[PDB]
Structures are given as structure tokens and as C-alpha cells.
Amino acid sequence: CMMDCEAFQILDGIKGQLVGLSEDPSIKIPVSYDRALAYVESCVHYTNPQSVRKVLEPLKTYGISDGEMCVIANASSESVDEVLAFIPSLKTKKEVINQPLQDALEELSKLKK
Amino acid sequence: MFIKVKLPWDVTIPAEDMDTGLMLQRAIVIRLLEAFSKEKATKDLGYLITPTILENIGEGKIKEQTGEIQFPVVFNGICFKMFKGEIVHGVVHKVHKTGVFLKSGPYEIIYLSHMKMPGYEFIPGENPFFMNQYMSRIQIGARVRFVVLDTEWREAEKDFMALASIDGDNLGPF
Amino acid sequence: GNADLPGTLSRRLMFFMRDIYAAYDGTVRNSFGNQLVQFTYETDGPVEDITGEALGSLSACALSEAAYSALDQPISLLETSPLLNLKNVLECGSKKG
Amino acid sequence: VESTPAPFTQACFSSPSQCFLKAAKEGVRDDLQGSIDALAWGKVPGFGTGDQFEIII
Amino acid sequence: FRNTGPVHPLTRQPVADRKRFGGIKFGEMERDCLIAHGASANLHERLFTLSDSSQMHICRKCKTYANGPYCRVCVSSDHVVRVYVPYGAKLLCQELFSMGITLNFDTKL
Amino acid sequence: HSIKLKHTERGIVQKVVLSSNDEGKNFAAVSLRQVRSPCLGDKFSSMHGQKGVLGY
Amino acid sequence: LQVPVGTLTSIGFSISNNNDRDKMSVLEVEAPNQVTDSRLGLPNPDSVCRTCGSKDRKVCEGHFGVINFAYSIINPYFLKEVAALLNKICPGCKYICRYCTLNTGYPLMKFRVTTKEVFRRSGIVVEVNEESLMKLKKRGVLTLPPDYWSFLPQDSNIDESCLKPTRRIITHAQVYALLLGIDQRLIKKDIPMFNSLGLTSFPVTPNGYRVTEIVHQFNGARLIFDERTRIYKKLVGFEGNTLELSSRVMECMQYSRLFSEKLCGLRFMKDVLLGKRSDHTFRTVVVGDPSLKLNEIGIPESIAKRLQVSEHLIFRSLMDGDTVLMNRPPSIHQHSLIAMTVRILPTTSVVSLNPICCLPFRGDFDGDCLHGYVPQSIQAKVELDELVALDKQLINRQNGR
Amino acid sequence: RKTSKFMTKYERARILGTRALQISMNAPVMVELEGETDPLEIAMKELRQRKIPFTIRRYLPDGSFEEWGVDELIVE
DNA sequence: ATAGGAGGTATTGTGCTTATCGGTAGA
RNA sequence: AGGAGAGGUA
DNA sequence: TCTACCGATAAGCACAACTACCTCTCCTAT
Ligand SMILES: [Mg+2]
Ligand SMILES: [Zn+2]
Ligand SMILES: [Zn+2]
Ligand SMILES: [Zn+2]
């Protein structure tokens, strides 16, 4: 469920735990640690409580599948023409008006200062 | 699809260190770390980093060879699934005549084919080839979003290789 | 030439009685389907600590000892040797006719 | 009579070919309950040793 | 006496020749006596470990025998288990397949 | 090719005999001799059926 | 790659069909001269395996190949069931009809299988009861009606037999024709394995178990191969009548080691699965030594220095304190197996045993040989002196004395 | 429950063998042994001092099983 | 691929599976 | 190297 | 009065007629 915000928060814990008792009697692998520092530096959120709650609000108020939420949130489209051209599952649908989607775009815009 | 699903395991612990009952939990987590570290790969699941939450542990089964004991432990962890129809950004590493390299993290290698982006002529007048024919400059370090396709896997390395397509909108860096 | 009789008898008896073992509940059960052979062991004392020992194997070994010991085979007229008597006694279903 | 199928032990006793053919025709299932069957396939008989299990915790 | 030596071409067992470091046959009577004593580790070692030892691969999905392991009856599956059985068991399975009998194995792990 | 002595073959060469038949096939015979002193495990017999091995 | 370990259980028995036979076979060519192919087994005269890697006949298993048949062949194991079923059901009424009523002049027919009596072929030969023939004879009927055999479709596989008008060999194609129109419930009840009715293929033995590439005295690379191999090669080219092919298949199936005829049948089982030979074993003549203890066995220094045991710190020579399992063949009782501590003695090529301990072995010092077993695993040694030791067997289990 | 509450010879031998195998693989000993160089002796000492962290699961023929411990059981 | 008449003699021993052989019981 | 046939041990 | 299975009398068919073993000789057509 952690896409950009909660994923970064938990990675600070292991880095904060690494400084304590860094010695290890076993053999460690450096590939796994490199995959964490070089992938999460693309997009980062500010606060955890108000970000994870806001993205889950359209799930209850509107009808969106679990797989559709992940792709839209990661892409973070800045217009209405892009969301109707990326995912082919939104073609020829009238369930949700575009105006509430535009309002949600503004709501996502104020979160990122 | 970053759903944290459970994954049982049958990690075996050597009899080299079996003591300190008051601190036995310290040895259990260390053995668990060395379990996925040895493999560090998957076929159709993805990748795992750290065992953040441990759900439960099982009874210690003793197998009579080289003094080995097994422990069944079920826990949840971070996983990533490259589902079809996902817009994931990535950084470019090097530019070549064929197979443009795109690095969406060191966990996998992504190659760019010729029939993925708009038609253009490679510029040989400078050191790195440019694709500024459609008013867009792409270099190393710039984040470019693209749609993912079906991924392949190997036999030994089992690398999650995939193909990058720029047929969608919002192409180039943002 | 008649030394094959004790060997064959011991082999057949062991094949029949190998699966017999004692259970933790005190009963005597066969290995095939946990069939109840004896509800309680009929020993005349004095220790009932036998739990995992194969009673059928021990009985088969004892009867094999009896068969091999009685290898004199006199076979007198109108008489049978002790080995022949043991073979006839142990084989009851064969003499149905 | 006991409704316990042991094709392997019966084959090892006498006439393995006929016993195996009859078992194949009948499509019976062998659970390897016998000691000799377990021994032939690298398994403990379970009479004296192997009837119980050892668990660390 | 024998510690290590050549094996028979048919079955992976020590040869009977004394001059070629031959072994001692573990007869049925000795096995029955050891069963009566109740010692299984010695019996398991004498019949599997020090005797003909081999490995067999069984597909978890389809109860068939697969020759890494790969069975052509079903698709390439990553769930294949390995069992430790004596080479005599494999020889018996091959003989049964040759005569026209197919064995199905349902592993418990 | 060459023939080598086995594990329990030992002795001292006494004579070598070379011969051939009418067909032209050559035959070679080598004899090895050794002294067999009475060992502990040797078995001795009498003239009246007494059988036994050396004890000490 | 790496596969998880598992425990074998629940062995099922079934008759092989064409699907499993085809699936199991790998690189199953149909060339008569490719019986000893390089893709099946290591002992082939190339020392290279296509499926597996290079090995010394220790990491490569025997692959299987299955040839293909132009025409379908009935399964010999189901021959009796089909013969019994055809006897009950009419050949031209398909019910439980000129062949029904006795007033129509058609006698009943008996279906049976001959065994090397007429044409040395194990097939279905239908016979008419001679008791009914005599009844027709007494009523003025000498010959069978011309339309008596009208229920048998014409088959090109029929050859020149000219045995008798009363008896005819049923072609394998005719067998399927007669089975048509019968309810599947009746067929399934008599034949539990319906999928194995058609035998369109036959496997060949792997080179790792058939190619006898023995040293053949001088002919090191003679590649003598199995004997049945000739029949399997002769079965590659099959044409014409299918009865000959069925007879060849039936004859070839009888060359398996499980069928009785020295290493065949029950003897094969005894020598493979029941009786096995193990390493770390020594056999020497035993003599008496009253000075040695009852629980101690004398081991010569010459043999002890060569016998190697497995001790975790990798082999070390036998020394004092180790335990061995002594036995005198035949083992008439469980007391024959006695665990005794190894004692090194200056004597060579002989083992010393206390004269008192001869009673459990039921032997005497007149040429008797005791062969011992040296345990390698630590657990085996631990359980050896706790259950099979001399002090643990002080009470006789036969009479209690 | 419904057990003899006595450690049989076979179970004792198996426990001793398992403990000896564990000790032979360079494993720490819960009990303190002075002048001991054989894993079997250390295993026997631990069994006498009933400090072995082993549990016995006895499989009843009906299919059920009862969980026991070496400390709860007594050795004759 | 061919070749290997014809002879009175001189293994039992237990189970198993036929056939056949009349043989009464019922409508 | 595998088999067949004889003389033999406990 | 004519069907309808139904136990007896020979005729073949199939394994079983022992362990642990140790040597020698002979064998692979034409
Ligand atoms: Mg004697
Ligand atoms: Zn499969
Ligand atoms: Zn191969
Ligand atoms: Zn009809």
C-alpha cells in the first residue's frame, strides 16, 4: 500500500537502525541496500497523516478499483486529457463527472507545496 | 501494485549457535535476514527489502543432517509487482545507437527498442546522441515517465527485464 | 536338503509378524491400518514398561530359534520330526482338505 | 478382509509381477504403511525409533 | 574389508569380488534382527546411506516423474520437490514403466 | 594391455615360460612363489576327523 | 537449479496409457538404426549426453524413448476383460437378434484367448460351442450358414490362415468396431481404466539400463547391449497385419526382469531391494582369547589402520573405544547382533573373541568367520551401544533366562 | 495425558544421539562440564541434569498426539 | 540368409483356473 | 566386465 | 412335458523347492 510516502518513512528506520550495532557476524549483501537509496529519490511527500487519508477518500466516496489507484497516484497526472489517454479502462465511461476529478486534482495540488 | 502480502518460509538455522533462551529472538531474525539475502531474486513476485512485521513463528523441526533445525515463519514484507498498464518514471544511464539504457532502479535493467518512440535520426555531431527532433532533450539523470509492458525473466540471474514504450502522452522529462 | 524348511518357515512367519508392534496406549496393533491384534498384552508380568518394542518380531525370532535348534530331523516311521510337527502346527490354513 | 492394500509387500513376498499387474489393473493406492515398504524407499519403520518426533519448542 | 571401491554396473552397490574391495551383503535376517532390536538409524544407514543412494525429482502439481528438473506432461513449473530414495527404487520404477505400469507419487512436502 | 597384480596377489618370480600353438597364438606363463608359515587363523586337521584352528 | 526436499508417500498404481507414455519420453525418434541414440543414456558410443551434462554415469539418469505405431493396438493386459465382455454381449444385437433366439438356427459363440496354441499369437479367437454344433448336426445341418460371420467388418490386416470356418482370429480393428454401440457404463464397470484401452506406442529401455557396454574380455567397447534390444529395433518398422505386431509386443513385455523365467523375478527383488551390500565392512576368521573381556572384540592392527571412520572435527583410522556390530551368518536370532568395543591387538589377519560369547553367536572356532559393521554416523554409534550392546542383552528374550 | 510418564529406551537413545550430533557440530552446552572431551559424555550429563531443551511428541495410533518434555519425564 | 525324424521312454508338489458333465429345481 | 558349469567353507 | 444355473473330475499353468559364502573352468554361433 506504501507508494511514495509510507515507503520512505520506514526506510529511515533501517538507516537509523544501521548506525546502531553495525557489526554483523554473518555475510551481508550490498545490492539490496543500493536498491532502496536509488529508487525512492524520485518522488517524496511531506507528511504521512494527511496524505494517506486524502488518497483513500475517493475510494469510499467514488468507485475505484485497487489496481486503478496505484497507477494514477504514481503517475500523478496534472490534467484531465492525460488520465483519459494513459489507462484504457476509462474509455467510454460516464460514472464519474470530470469536474469532481478536476477538483481532486486541485486537492492533490495543494498537498504538494 | 505494492501490496504487502504474506510469504511463508522454511528457514533453517545451523547448530553453531543454539543458546541464550532469554535472547533467542536475536538469533531468529539474523537467520531470517540471511534467508532472502542468499536468493535476492524472484520469478513473478518482485523484490523484498526488510522484514518489518513478523506475524508468527512455528515449531522447530529437527532434520538429521549436518546438525540443522528448521523454523517455519510467516511474515509480511514490501513487494512490487510490475502489472501491465502502469506509468513508472525512470532515469537514463547511457545513450547508444541501439538499446537505449533506462535505469528505473538497480533492481532491473530496461532496454529501449526502436519501435517504441517517434521516428528520428540519431545525431552524431556530439558525444551523446540526442532526441531533440520533437522538441524534447533527454540526458542522463533526467526522470522520464513511461508505460511498462510484459516483463521477462532469466534462468540463473532471473532478471526482471522489460521493454520501455513512449507511445503514451506526457513523454519526456517533467 | 531339508535345511530349507526352517529358513522358509522363519521367512514366512517374519513376513506375517513383522508389522506387529506395541502402542503407547498399552494395546498391540498391526502397522497396516492400526489393526487391533490384542487389547492388552497377555504377559504373566512382571514389568509393563515395554512400549516401543516389536513384540511380533521377538516372537518370530524365538520361533526361528526353536526351528533351527530342532534340526535333528529323525523322521521315524509313522512319526514326524519336531521340525515337521512345528511346520504342520504353524500351517493351519493349508490343511483345509 | 481388512481392506488394507499393500501391493509392495505382497509383491516382495511372492510373484511380484502378477501382484504388480493386479494392483495396476485394480488401481489401488499404497500408503507405505508397512515397515519393509518404508525401508525399501528410505524411510524409518517407526516401531522402536521414529514413532515420536523431537521439537525444539 | 572395504572402505571405498567400484560399484556394480547394473545397481550402484559394492561388487562381490574380494580382491576388488568387496563389501558384505546385509541379508534379510540381519535386517529383521535389527528391527527386533529397534535400532533404525543403523538400519537406515546400512540400506540407504552406505548402500545405493540416489535422488528422484517429482513435480508437485502433477504426480509424475520429472528428469534442472523438468516434466513435459505439464508446463515449466517452479514447484518441484526432490526425494531421497535408493537407486533400487529408481530401477524398480524404470522396470515398471518398461513393463507398462505408471506410478504416481504424492509427496507430503 | 599389461596385466597388474591384484590386492591380495604377491610373491617372488620363479620361472617364466613362453610357448605357442600351431595356430601361432603366443602364451606366457609367470609363476610366483611364497612361503606360508603357520599363522594364527590357519586350520589344521587330524587323521580321525578332528578339525580346528590355531588358537595361540 | 535448486529444488526443495520432500518426503515420498502415497504411491499409486495405474496402467500406462499413450498420453503419459508420450509425455515421459524425450527425443523419441522413429529411426530403426537410432536405437542406441546419443540422447538416451551415457553408455552410448559417444560419451556425450544431449539432455544432460558430461558425467561418469553418476549424475545422469536413464532417459526414456517411445516409438510410434501406424495402427492402434489393443492393450494385452485388458485382453481378458474384453474377451469376457464380448462373450456376454451379442456380436450383432448389442444388448445384455438372430444370435439371441435358439429357433433361428444360430448357435451361441464363446470368446476366449489362446496362448501359443494355434499361431503363437495371444489374441481374441471366438469359438462356437461344439455341444450346440452336435445339436445342429443331428437336425440335418452340416455346415454353418454363409451369413454367420456377417457381423465382422472387412479388414485389410487379415492374412492367409485357412484354419477352420468355425474359428476366426479377431482383428484389432474389428475389436473397436464391436465395442461401438455399447453403453459406456457397462464398459467402465468391467474395465476401470478406459483411457488405457488404446496402445499406440511402446517405450524402449534406457541405455543406462539396457546398453551393456561391458569390457567383453578384450572388446572393451563391444557395446553388446541388451538382448531384447533386437526385438525393439525390429519393432521400429511395423506394417501389414497387426496381429504379428501385438505378438511381438507381448513377447517383448515378457523379457522384463520382474517376470519369472538367475537375477529375475523374486530373486531380482531380493538382490536389489531386500538384500543390499554396504561399505565399511570387514570379514575375518575368529579365534578364542580368554584374556579379552566379553564386551571387547580384538581387531588386528593391520586392518584397523586401513579401516576409516567418519569423525567430525575427514576420516581417521580405527582405534580403541569405537563400537562395531558383529554378526555370524545366518542370523537365527536377534542376539547375533552384538555391539563390542574395538580393542587393538598385535595379532594380524584374525579377530579375537572371548570363548564365553560363542553361545549368543552359536558358533565355534573351527573356521567360522565373523563379519562386522562399522557405523559412520554419530547417532548410529550412540544407538548401537544403548540397545544392541552386550550389557543391554543380558536377559534372553526367548525364555527370560 | 494417558501416557506411562516414563522415558523409554528408544526415546532416550534418540535424544542422546541428537544431542551428541548437535554438540559435535560445535554447539554451546547448557550444562557445565569439567574435563569432558566426548560429546556423548556431555549429552549423558545433560540428560542426568535434565537441562536439555527438547520436547517429545508422541503420536497416538488413532491420529492424535500428545506433547511432552524431557524435564517432565523421568529417566530410570 | 541357411543349418542344428523322431525314439519308448526312464521331478514332484501344492495352489489355481478352466472345461465338461451330468444333474436336479422350477414353470 | 557380465554370465553358464563344476568342486567346495561355516 | 423344457429351461437354468450348479456343484464335482480331469487338464493343464505357475511358483517353490534354504542362508553367508569361496575358488576354478569355459563363454560368447556359422
Ligand atoms: Mg563350525
Ligand atoms: Zn509437472
Ligand atoms: Zn542425460
Ligand atoms: Zn442379441
CA dihedral (G52, G56, G57, G59) positive or negative: negative
**Cβ of D9: how many Cβ atoms within 10 Å?**
22
**Eight-state DSSP code of residue G167:** B
At B6, the amino acid letter reads K
Q: Domain residue spans in chain H?
A: 1-76
| DSSP secondary structure of G28-68 | ----TT-TT-TTS-STTTTS--SSS---SSSS-----EEEE
Show the cell assigned to H25.
Answer: 557440530
**Closest residue (CA to C1') to nucleotide J4 in the complex:** G262
DSSP β-ladder status, B143-148 and B100-103: unpaired
Residue G254 CB contacts under 8 Å (≥ 6 apart), including other chains: none
- Integer angstrom CA distances of residue G268 from D6, E30, G61, G275: 19, 19, 20, 10
HSE-CB of B155 using CA atoms within 13 angstroms: 5
At H18, the amino acid letter reads T
Please give the Cα distance from B49 to B55 (Å, whole number): 17
3-state secondary structure of G355: helix
- Integer angstrom CA distances of residue H72 from B18, H68, H75: 22, 7, 10
Q: Looking up cell 504342520, which residue turns up?
A: C88
Nearest nucleotide relative to G367: CA against C1' = J10
Q: Are G372 and G281 in contact (CB under 8 A)?
A: yes
Cis peptide before G346 (omega within 30 of 0): no
**Would you say how long chain E is, in residues?**
109
Q: Smallest Cα–Cα separation from E79: which of E89, E88, E71?
A: E71
- Integer angstrom CA distances of residue F33 from F9, F29, F37, G67: 11, 13, 13, 59
CA dihedral (E29, E32, E33, E39) positive or negative: positive
- Integer angstrom CA distances of residue G83 from C83, F9, G124, G137: 48, 64, 7, 27
H near C: at least 3 beta-carbon pairs less than 8 Å apart: yes
CA of E27 to C1' of K20 (A): 8
Q: Looking up cell 553388446, which residue turns up?
A: G224
Residue E86 CB contacts under 8 Å (≥ 6 apart), including other chains: D40, D41, D42, E47, E48, E51, E52, E53, E54, G273, G276
**Eight-state DSSP code of residue D54:** E
Q: Are C61 and E36 in contact (CB under 8 A)?
A: yes
CA dihedral (C3, C6, C8, C14) positive or negative: negative
- Integer angstrom CA distances of residue G163 from G121, G141, G169: 14, 21, 10
From the DSSP assignment, how many helices (H) and strands (E) are in chain D?
3, 2
Q: What are phi and psi of G15, to 5 degrees?
A: -90, 130
Q: Which nucleotides of I are covered by protein (CB under 7 A)?
A: 14-15, 19-20
Confirm whether residue G357 is marked as ligand binding: no
Residue G20 CB contacts under 8 Å (≥ 6 apart), including other chains: E64, E73, E102
Nearest nucleotide relative to C91: CA against C1' = I14
Angle between helices H39-48 and H9-24 (to 10 degrees): 130
> E41 and H10 in contact by Cβ < 8 A?
no
- Integer angstrom CA distances of residue A58 from A4, A92, G245, H65: 18, 20, 74, 52
Residue G382 CB contacts under 8 Å (≥ 6 apart), including other chains: H13, H16, H17, H20, H40, H43
Distance, CA G227 to ligand 3 centroid (Å)? 23
Q: Are D10 and D19 in contact (CB under 8 A)?
A: yes
Residue G42 CB contacts under 8 Å (≥ 6 apart), including other chains: G49, G55, G57, G60, G207, G208
G246 alpha-carbon distance from chain centroid: 21
User: What's the maximum distance between 2 C-alpha atoms anywhere in chain F?
Assistant: 55
Q: Smallest Cα–Cα separation from G266: which of G258, G277, G255?
A: G258
Please give the Cα distance from A23 to B18 (Å, whole number): 20
Q: For A98-101, which contacts have Cβ atoms below 8 Å and span 24 or more sequence positions?
A: A100/A62
**Cβ of G367: how many Cβ atoms within 10 Å?**
13
Asked if the C-beta of G2 comes within 8 angstroms of chain B's C-beta atoms, the answer is no
Resolution in A: 3.1
- Cβ-based contacts (< 7 Å) between C 4-63 and strand K: 4, 6-8
> B14 and H25 in contact by Cβ < 8 A?
yes
3-state secondary structure of A19: coil
| DSSP secondary structure of G199-256 | EEEEEE--HHHH------TT-TT-----SHHHHHHHTSS--S-HHHHHHHHHHHHTTS
Show the cell assigned to B96.
Answer: 547508444
Q: Are G283 and E1 in contact (CB under 8 A)?
A: yes
Please give the Cα distance from G108 to G101 (Å, whole number): 9
Nearest to F53 among G285, G347, G349 (CB): G285
Q: What share of chain D is helix, strand, coil (3-state, %, to 5)?
A: 40, 10, 45
Q: What are phi and psi of B87, to 5 degrees?
A: -95, 105
Strand partners for G371: G283, G327
Where is chain E discontinuous (C–N over 2.5 Å), named by the preceding residue? 67
Please give the Cα distance from G278 to G200 (Å, whole number): 43
Residue C17 CB contacts under 8 Å (≥ 6 apart), including other chains: C56, C57, C59, C60
> Which residues of chain D from 19 to 38 reach within 8 Å of chain H, CB to CB?
none
Cis peptide before G375 (omega within 30 of 0): no
Q: Looking up cell 523484498, which residue turns up?
A: B48
Please give the Cα distance from H69 to H76 (Å, whole number): 16
| DSSP secondary structure of A46-60 | S-SHHHHHHHHHHHH
At G288, the amino acid letter reads G
Show the cell assigned to E109.
Answer: 512436502
Q: Are A79 and B170 in contact (CB under 8 A)?
A: no
**Cβ of G214: how many Cβ atoms within 10 Å?**
15
Show the cell assigned to E98.
Answer: 518398461
The vertex-H8 CA angle with G384 and G338, nearest 5°, equals: 25
**Eight-state DSSP code of residue E48:** I
Show the cell assigned to G43.
Answer: 553408455
**Burial letters G94-115, b for 16+ CB under 10 A, else e:** eeeeeeeeeeeebbebebeebe
Structure determination technique employed: cryo-EM
**Cβ of E21: how many Cβ atoms within 10 Å?**
16
**Burial letters B83-118, b for 16+ CB under 10 A, else e:** eeebbbbbbbeebeeeebbbbbbebbebebeeebbe
Helix (H) or strand (E) holding D52: strand D52-55
CA dihedral (G43, G46, G49, G53) positive or negative: positive
CA closest to A8 among chain B residues: B78
Q: Looking up cell 576409516, which residue turns up?
A: G308
Where is chain G discontinuous (C–N over 2.5 Å), named by the preceding residue? 96, 261, 313
CB pairs under 8 A between E and F: 8
Residues flanking ion ligand 3, Cβ below 5 Å: G 49, 51-52, 60
- Cβ-based contacts (< 7 Å) between G 124-163 and strand K: none
> Which residues of chain G from 364 to 383 reach within 8 Å of chain H, CB to CB?
378-380, 382-383
At B60, the amino acid letter reads G
Please give the Cα distance from H72 to H76 (Å, whole number): 13
**Closest residue (CA to C1') to nucleotide I15 in the complex:** C94
DSSP β-ladder status, G351-353 and G281-288: parallel
Show the cell assigned to D46.
Answer: 517407526
- Closest approach of chain D CAs to the CA of G175, in angstroms? 20
Show the cell assigned to E52.
Answer: 545405493
Residue C52 CB contacts under 8 Å (≥ 6 apart), including other chains: C21, C22, D47, D48, D49, D51, E38, H8, H9, H10, H11
- Closest approach of chain E CAs to the CA of H8, in angstroms? 12
Q: Are G350 and G375 in contact (CB under 8 A)?
A: no
Q: For F38-46, which contacts have Cβ atoms below 8 Å and span 24 or more sequence positions?
A: F39/G349, F39/G350, F40/G287, F40/G347, F40/G349, F40/G350, F41/G284, F41/G285, F41/G287, F41/G349, F41/G350, F43/G366, F43/G367
Confirm whether residue E33 is marked as ligand binding: no
Residue G149 CB contacts under 8 Å (≥ 6 apart), including other chains: G168
Please give the Cα distance from G66 to G236 (Å, whole number): 10
Ligand nearest to the CA of G20: 2
Nearest nucleotide relative to G84: CA against C1' = I18
B123 alpha-carbon distance from chain centroid: 33
Q: Smallest Cα–Cα separation from A78: which of A70, A66, A86?
A: A86
Q: Are G174 and G155 in contact (CB under 8 A)?
A: yes
The rounded radius of gyration (Å) of the Cα atoms in chain D is 14
Strand partners for D40: none
Q: Are D34 and C16 in contact (CB under 8 A)?
A: no
CA dihedral (G26, G29, G33, G39) positive or negative: negative
Please give the Cα distance from E58 to C71 (Å, whole number): 50
Q: Smallest Cα–Cα separation from E7: which of G59, G278, F4?
A: G278
Q: Which nucleotides of K are covered by protein (CB under 7 A)?
A: 3, 13-23, 27-28
At G32, the amino acid letter reads P
Show the cell assigned to G121.
Answer: 499369437
Q: Smallest Cα–Cα separation from A39: which of G209, B105, B76?
A: B105
Q: Smallest Cα–Cα separation from A32: which of B34, B1, B102?
A: B34
Q: Smallest Cα–Cα separation from B19: which of G377, H75, H46?
A: H46
Q: Are H3 and C51 in contact (CB under 8 A)?
A: no
- Integer angstrom CA distances of residue H12 from C48, G382, G390, H19, H69: 17, 10, 18, 11, 12
Q: Smallest Cα–Cα separation from C68: which of C1, C3, C15?
A: C3
**Cβ of A11: how many Cβ atoms within 10 Å?**
19
Show the cell assigned to G152.
Answer: 465382422
Please give the Cα distance from G145 to G239 (Å, whole number): 33
**Cβ of G124: how many Cβ atoms within 10 Å?**
22
Q: Looking up cell 568367520, which residue turns up?
A: G369
At E103, the amino acid letter reads L
Please give the Cα distance from G389 to G110 (Å, whole number): 68
In chain A, residues with a C-beta closer than 8 Å to the C-beta of B169 are 81-82, 85-86
Ligand nearest to the CA of G43: 3
At G225, the amino acid letter reads F
3-state secondary structure of G318: coil
> B85 and A71 in contact by Cβ < 8 A?
yes
Please give the Cα distance from G203 to G62 (Å, whole number): 13
DSSP β-ladder status, B143-148 and B87-92: antiparallel
> E38 and H10 in contact by Cβ < 8 A?
yes
A near H: at least 3 beta-carbon pairs less than 8 Å apart: no
- Closest approach of chain G CAs to the CA of B28, in angstroms? 21
CA dihedral (G17, G18, G23, G24) positive or negative: positive
3-state secondary structure of A98: helix
DSSP β-ladder status, G296-300 and G338-345: parallel
Residue H45 CB contacts under 8 Å (≥ 6 apart), including other chains: H31, H33, H36
Show the cell assigned to E62.
Answer: 502433477
DSSP β-ladder status, G308-309 and G316-317: antiparallel
Q: Are E39 and G383 in contact (CB under 8 A)?
A: yes
HSE-CB of G38 using CA atoms within 13 angstroms: 8
